[PDB]
Amino acid sequence: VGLGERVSPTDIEEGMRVGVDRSKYNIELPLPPRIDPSVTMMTVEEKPDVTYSDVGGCKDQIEKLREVVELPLLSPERFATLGIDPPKGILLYGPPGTGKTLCA
Amino acid sequence: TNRVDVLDPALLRSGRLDRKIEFPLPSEDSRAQILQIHSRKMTTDDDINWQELARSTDEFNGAQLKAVTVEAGMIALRNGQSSVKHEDFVEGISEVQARKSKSVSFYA
Amino acid sequence: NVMLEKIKDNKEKIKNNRQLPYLVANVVEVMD
Ligand SMILES: Nc1ncnc2c1ncn2[C@@H]1O[C@H](COP(=O)(O)OP(=O)(O)NP(=O)(O)O)[C@@H](O)[C@H]1O
Ligand SMILES: [Mg+2]
């Protein structure tokens, strides 16, 4: 098919759902890209109160959390001087119900 | 593909896949180099002694050596030094090792 | 001049068919 009613090509994104003609097959009106909007917004949880007091015990994994997240943010000057890469990606893993989310 | 003993006998004919080149291990020559290039990225100090490290490490591949140096920076950061110490590399060696780091006696 | 005009009419009919949308297909094989 080709270009919409009079809509810019940039607005006609990849994966974006579109209404087309019943029999003359051509874009008319853009439609919401899927239904990722609104569903997702339910799922989002924002900065909970959860602190290490509410985490039962402390282990080495938590000490390895602290380095990655806390240290480059408070002072990226330290990471430069060392000339190491600054950690900013982490993979957390183990058995479920460990409390992986609680520490995050 | 990792050893030819595992590979099947009919596709391992000479002149089929041309030369067959075996990789000999690091020999305390190549080790020192391999480390040197990995530390070039991080800050370079004379506190570090590359030759000593080459001697410590025995039967370690390129991959393993690389891990020894990456582990050193996490340790230096943890200490909070501006610059990594030779001391930290030694500690990375026994962390990359399968066995648990130096601890008091309790069975041996 | 005469010959060129005859090309111009033939080209316009080809133009009508080529106009979007059109079925998309794939050619399994050419017998020829
Ligand atoms: N250290 C802790 N302090 C307090 N309660 C805890 C602690 N650790 C585990 N719990 C409890 O156990 C629950 C299960 O851990 P939770 O954080 O829900 O999952 P997870 O390990 O991230 N799992 P999954 O992503 O499903 O594989 C917690 O929400 C708390 O109820
Ligand atoms: Mg979880």
Whole-angstrom Cα distance, residue C5 to residue C22? 28
Supply the DSSP string of B56-70, one letter for each residue.
H--S--HHHHHHHHH
- Select from B76, B66, B73 the least CA-distant residue to B96: B66
Resolution in A: 7.8
Whole-angstrom Cα distance, residue A88 to residue A67? 10
Supply the DSSP string of A30-95, one letter for each residue.
E--STT-TTHHHHH--------TTSSSS--HHHHHHHHHHHHHHH-THHHHHHTPPPP------SS
Which of the 8 DSSP states describes residue A10? G
Helix (H) or strand (E) holding A28: strand A27-30
Residues in Cβ contact with A90 at an 8 Å cutoff, skipping those fewer than 6 apart: A65, A68, A69
CA of A92 to the centre of ligand 1 (A): 13
| B73: its two tokens | 């920076």
**Tokens 């209404």 appear where?**
A19
Is residue A72 within 8 A of residue A80, CB to CB? The reply is: no
Query: What is the residue with the minimal CA distance to atom 14 of ligand 1?
Result: A97
**Tokens 């982490």 appear where?**
A90
Whole-angstrom Cα distance, residue B91 to residue B89? 5
3-state secondary structure of B91: helix
Burial label for B31, CB within 10 Å (0-12, 13-18, 19+), is buried
User: How, if at all, do strands A27-30 and A18-20 pair?
Assistant: antiparallel
Is residue B51 within 8 A of residue B32, CB to CB? The reply is: yes
Reported as half-sphere exposure (CB side, CA atoms, 13 A), residue B82 has a value of: 3
Shortest CA distance from A23: residue in chain C: C21
Whole-angstrom Cα distance, residue B72 to residue B84? 7
3-state secondary structure of A29: strand
Q: What is each CA distance from B32 to A56, A83, B67, in whole angstroms? A: 45, 20, 14
Atom of ligand 1 nearest to the CA of A104: 22
Is residue C11 within 8 A of residue C18, CB to CB? The reply is: no
Chain A touching partners, 3 or more CB pairs below 8 A: B, C
- Select from B89, B24, B84, B88 the least CA-distant residue to B53: B89
Whole-angstrom Cα distance, residue A56 to residue A103? 10
Out of A67, A78, A81, whose CB is closest to B74? A67
Whole-angstrom Cα distance, residue C21 to residue A23? 10
Is residue A31 within 8 A of residue A18, CB to CB? The reply is: yes
CA of B48 to the centre of ligand 2 (A): 41
Q: Determined by which method? A: cryo-EM
Q: Which amino acid is at B106?
A: F
Residues in Cβ contact with B53 at an 8 Å cutoff, skipping those fewer than 6 apart: B31, B32, B35, B68, B89, B90, B93
Q: Which ligand is nearest to the CA of A58?
A: 1
Shortest CA distance from B71: residue in chain A: A84
Ranges of H-type helices in C1-32:
2-18
3-state helix, strand, coil in chain B (%, to 5): 45, 0, 55
- Select from B1, B7, B39 the least CA-distant residue to B21: B1
Cα-flanking dihedrals φ and ψ of residue A18, to 5°? -145, 150
Is residue B75 within 8 A of residue B68, CB to CB? The reply is: no
Residue burial C1-32, b: 16+ Cβ < 10 Å; e: rest: eeeeeeeeeeeeeeeeeeeeeeeeeeeeeeee
